[PDB]
Amino acid sequence: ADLAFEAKSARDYAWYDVSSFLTYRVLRTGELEVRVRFSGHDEWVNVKTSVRERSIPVEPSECGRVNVGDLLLCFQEREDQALYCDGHVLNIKRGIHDHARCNCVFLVRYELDNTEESLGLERICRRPE
Numbered sequence: 489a490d491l492a493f494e495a496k497s498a499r500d501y502a503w504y505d506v507s508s509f510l511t512y513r514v515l516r517t518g519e520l521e522v523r524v525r526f527s528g529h530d531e532w533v534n535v536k537t538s539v540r541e542r543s544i545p546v547e548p549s550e551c552g553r554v555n556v557g558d559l560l561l562c563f564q565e566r567e568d569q570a571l572y573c574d575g576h577v578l579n580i581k582r583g584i585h586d587h588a589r590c591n592c593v594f595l596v597r598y599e600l601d602n603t604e605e606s607l608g609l610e611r612i613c614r615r616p617e
């Protein structure tokens with residue numbers, strides 16, 4: 489099936505699903521940027537760093553494929569806002585569950601500010617592969 493992407497916002501440094509792409513531009517420094525139209529407004533993002541293939545949700549029967557050190561798109565809830573930003577799995581507490589719901593617990597370190605949090609499979613999306 490078709491490719492779908494997400495783009496990193498230069499405002500909050502989170503990732504959003506790209507609905508479509510509009511145009512591109514080169515910087516005199518040489519970087520390639522792309523104008524991205526989001527889902528749900530309009531940004532320029534570094535192709536090389538800030539554009540990638542959309543993260544994939546993980547099904548309870550899959551949780552074995554997520555490991556310590558992995559990079560993950562994590563749902564990050566705070567006061568008002570909530571963002572989907574990059575983090576790395578530091579430690580995993582495996583639970584007992586079936587195919588219905590994953591109660592394994594993932595300690596991840598957010599890339600931006602280096603903070604830590606315990607997330608359930610329901611709040612993480614893996615990178616392809």
Ligand SMILES: [Zn+2]
Binds near residue numbers: 583591
């Ligand atoms: Zn699990």
